[PDB]
From a paper:
Biogenesis of the small ribosomal subunit in eukaryotes starts in the nucleolus with the formation of a 90S precursor and ends in the cytoplasm. Here, we elucidate the enigmatic structural transitions of assembly intermediates from human and yeast cells during the nucleoplasmic maturation phase. After dissociation of all 90S factors, the 40S body adopts a close-to-mature conformation, whereas the 3' major domain, later forming the 40S head, remains entirely immature. By combining yeast and human structures, we uncovered 16 different pre-40S assembly intermediates, most of which represent the long-sought nucleoplasmic pre-40S ribosome.
According to the sequential recruitment of the uS2–uS5–eS21 ribosomal protein cluster and NOB1, we identified two more new sub-states, RRP12-A2 and RRP12-A3, respectively. However, in human cells, uS2–uS5–eS21 inserts into the particle as a protein cluster only in the late state RRP12-A2. Moreover, we were able to visualize a detailed assembly process, setting up endonuclease NOB1 in its inactive conformation to await the signal from RIOK1 to execute the final cleavage at site 3 (17). This includes recruitment of the uS2–uS5–eS21 cluster and NOB1 and maturation of 18S rRNA helices h35–37. In addition to providing a near complete model for AFs BUD23, TRMT112, TSR1, BYSL, NOB1, LTV1 and RRP12, we could newly assign the positions of CK1 and SLX9 in state RRP12-A.
Residue numbers in the entry:
A (entry chain b): 2 to 83
B (entry chain y): 7 to 131, 206 to 222, 230 to 329, 390 to 412
C (entry chain C): 60 to 275
D (entry chain A): 2 to 217
E (entry chain V): 1 to 83
Write the structure that this text describes.
Amino acid sequence: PLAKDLLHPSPEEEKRKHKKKRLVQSPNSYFMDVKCPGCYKITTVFSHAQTVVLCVGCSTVLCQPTGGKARLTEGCSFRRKQ
Amino acid sequence: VVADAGAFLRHAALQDIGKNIYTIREVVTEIRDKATRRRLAVLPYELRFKEPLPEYVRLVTEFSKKTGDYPSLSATDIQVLALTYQLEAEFVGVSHLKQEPQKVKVSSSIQHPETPLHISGFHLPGGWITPSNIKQIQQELEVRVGCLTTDFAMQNVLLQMGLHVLAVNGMLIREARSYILRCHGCFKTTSDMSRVFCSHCGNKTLKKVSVTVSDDGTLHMHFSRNPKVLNPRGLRYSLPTPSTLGAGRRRLNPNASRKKFVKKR
Amino acid sequence: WMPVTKLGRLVKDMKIKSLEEIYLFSLPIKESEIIDFFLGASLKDEVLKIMPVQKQTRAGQRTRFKAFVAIGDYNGHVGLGVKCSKEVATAIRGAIILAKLSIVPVRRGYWGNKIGKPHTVPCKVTGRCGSVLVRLIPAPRGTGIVSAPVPKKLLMMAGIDDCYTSARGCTATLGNFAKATFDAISKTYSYLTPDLWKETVFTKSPYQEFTDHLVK
Amino acid sequence: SGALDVLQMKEEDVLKFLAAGTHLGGTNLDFQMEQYIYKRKSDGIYIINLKRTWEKLLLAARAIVAIENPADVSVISSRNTGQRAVLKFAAATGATPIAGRFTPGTFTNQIQAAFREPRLLVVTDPRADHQPLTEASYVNLPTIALCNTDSPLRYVDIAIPCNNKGAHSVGLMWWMLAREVLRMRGTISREHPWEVMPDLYFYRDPEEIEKEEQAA
Amino acid sequence: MQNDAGEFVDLYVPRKCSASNRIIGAKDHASIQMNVAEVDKVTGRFNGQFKTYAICGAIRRMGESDDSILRLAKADGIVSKNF
RNA sequence: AAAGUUGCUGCAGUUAAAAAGCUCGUAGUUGGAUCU
RNA sequence: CAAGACGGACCAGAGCGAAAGCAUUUGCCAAGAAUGUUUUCAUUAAUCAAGAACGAAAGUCGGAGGUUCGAAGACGAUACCGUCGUAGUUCCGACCAUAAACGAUGCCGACCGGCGAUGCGGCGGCGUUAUUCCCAUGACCCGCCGGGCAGCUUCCGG
Ligand SMILES: [Zn+2]
């Protein structure tokens, strides 16, 4: 209190804050490569997806929508981007 | 047979079984109960008063501070331990007793510290309390010289030294189990069951930990592997700017629902 | 007069020069003889009001005289004293003592063009007491004091030649109204102005400066 | 204090700190004292960072060295667990001690037998010593304090973050503050440790003293 | 403060608070002025010099005084930057 | 004029006179940032 | 056995609703806040004169039913109380639009101290449980974020 650099907050405090209440607002989500166990293709999937993303070659269910982050099925691998 | 002040408080009339009844003056002149004072003038005076030698009192003090039971017991307890050690020394050869007490072993459990095991009036599954057992229920009940100690600290240090301790009944004690208070901040134990603040750190941080000792000089002491006891839930609240009744109201955390038209003082 | 405080011991000797270096360090004054030695040759006294309050007990209502007085040297110092005593002369005497204990500096400023000695409040200030609000506004030279009589007395004692005054609340309560204008003068002093923007160079404290004197 | 390679923490210092249980605090936290906590361990005890309280001890020592006269420094403790300790703290430098019940009006009522005018105040326990902090907020008196985590910081200028409930921790920290003020005051040097053992400042229970002389 | 002739027409100048730049009043009996001594950089000896900080009564009453003193000591280099 | 007891400057509406039982709603009043 | 009534305990510093208000199970119908969102549109908004919708209880018109209670009333004692008891209390369809209809406290927006409890949603994590469950999930534990109901503390200021 009464002495804190509002221009340079600590990064853990910026990650702690609400996504709109940061100094420059930014999303908490990400895009990710998903590799189906029955194949080896790459699918670009939003972390907070609301639709059932299907495999382009296997036509299998990749993620299940939830209230928050999407639930990937068991057996498929994922890797974050950027 | 060394008579402790607890034996005088419990009206333990064991002058017939033992003949070497000796004790110190301040353990009998500090009793504040008038019935014990009245009973002291009726009993025959076979009791003798003496003071232990400084060397033996000192060595009692070093292994009392080695065994960790140092702050729990008082100066009169030191005098009683010194007198019974001297009586054992000038009756029996001193090679029987030992020093460098054994390190304590760790053996945890999932039971809660406030589980009422070995309380006579309850029933865990039989377990019944008759009027014939009221005289029997005193403590955990299982040659020339013995001790009439009652508090667990003196019995603990005597069984750590291997000295045979006696009770109000005829037979001796083989196992002695009780509860002590252990600090989880500065790791110091206290056997005083009524204290609430710690000795070294000084916080209100003592918790119930069980102990059990045997005749051989082996001690094992049980924690509780229950996360209910060790959590800082109701421990932080804002304070206002600056007896046993109403005890359960304090054990509630302040940050909780009380009724809207009731008030905490 | 014997001194019982360290500041009293300092003012008993000719080690501390004026009242302004007591006021600079905001030290509490607990003896009226300090200001009697400093500026008591030019103080002027006046009683504002006397009211008997009654405390009823089984032997009747005991009568307690609240005396309202105010003092000042007409040059920049003013104090207001209230004391509840048992009779009249003790009440006015102890009220004089308390008004001596509560003497504050008075910052005086200009209205415009800054020629001669300062004559007005430096800025529009407001004092509060109870529901009573008193506002002091700078005035040109020769305006005099446009006030109620109680602020007339207080502002003449403070040395303020010219002032406009407004008042809100139960001004018929004399104690609250006198305390409101006293608060207003204290706030004339405690206001921050761009001429007080220079960085403060710090001076040795009189207790720290005269420490060999307190050793002996 | 300043990264000058002579006033830093030593291995003996941290060893004796962890031996005396100073670093562990209470179960409450006041939000003005968040910068002295390292972290919150899951047991429920706030630990106090050792370098922070080292620097705060050095700042308090620098504040207490700066007074040339050791006689006008008040050192007060109401709880018995520091009481005799502050008496020996007087034997450190000559700062006047007040142990036991504090007389109201000691700092503010000049017509008293016990009327003192110190220049710094050092306080063992802010919760037990609420009256001397209240009176120090009336006479322009600065304040050093030994503050636990569950301690308010009102009118406290240097709060030493330490366990002050236990006798060993408070006696040790009084001994350490005395050693620092005597080290850079001019009495002792840095090449040799102070001959006074830390256990000398420790408060002793009467139950401890009735069986201390038994082991002679 | 000053008239147009350049003369100093004022009783005295008050001390401004080192924490919040507030004017410390003449009847602010909770305000402090504190002296902190420095040491020699090679031997840690009190060399007689000092540094002065004044804190008004409002900052002390808020409980935010030691934070202000620590920040000022950081500004003057008394407390090390490895804090 | 006092009356800041008609209040734009400039009043009030828990307990003293005083906020509609609640919501929607045209008129009227007010309306984010941005272009050398 | 039947008749109508009413949903105890659980039931709270709880939840939902615009308010009045809402508590037996299951099924159907259409709404809804908060949350999550690297969706879409791009100022579409705030407040209310006129105007409109709902609005406890009592009361009024018409149909049905009247278990209990019960204004008025008839008895007995002494305005109080007891026995009996009409309208009403209940359901359906229209009127009425009033309450201490309360936070005796407009609505929207911004700033201004702390704490930890709780309801919901989201996120992260040692760990314990579905008789050392053989990965996930529900139940707990710790911590964070958002909107809430609601407390304690403070010389923020008023
Ligand atoms: Zn401890």
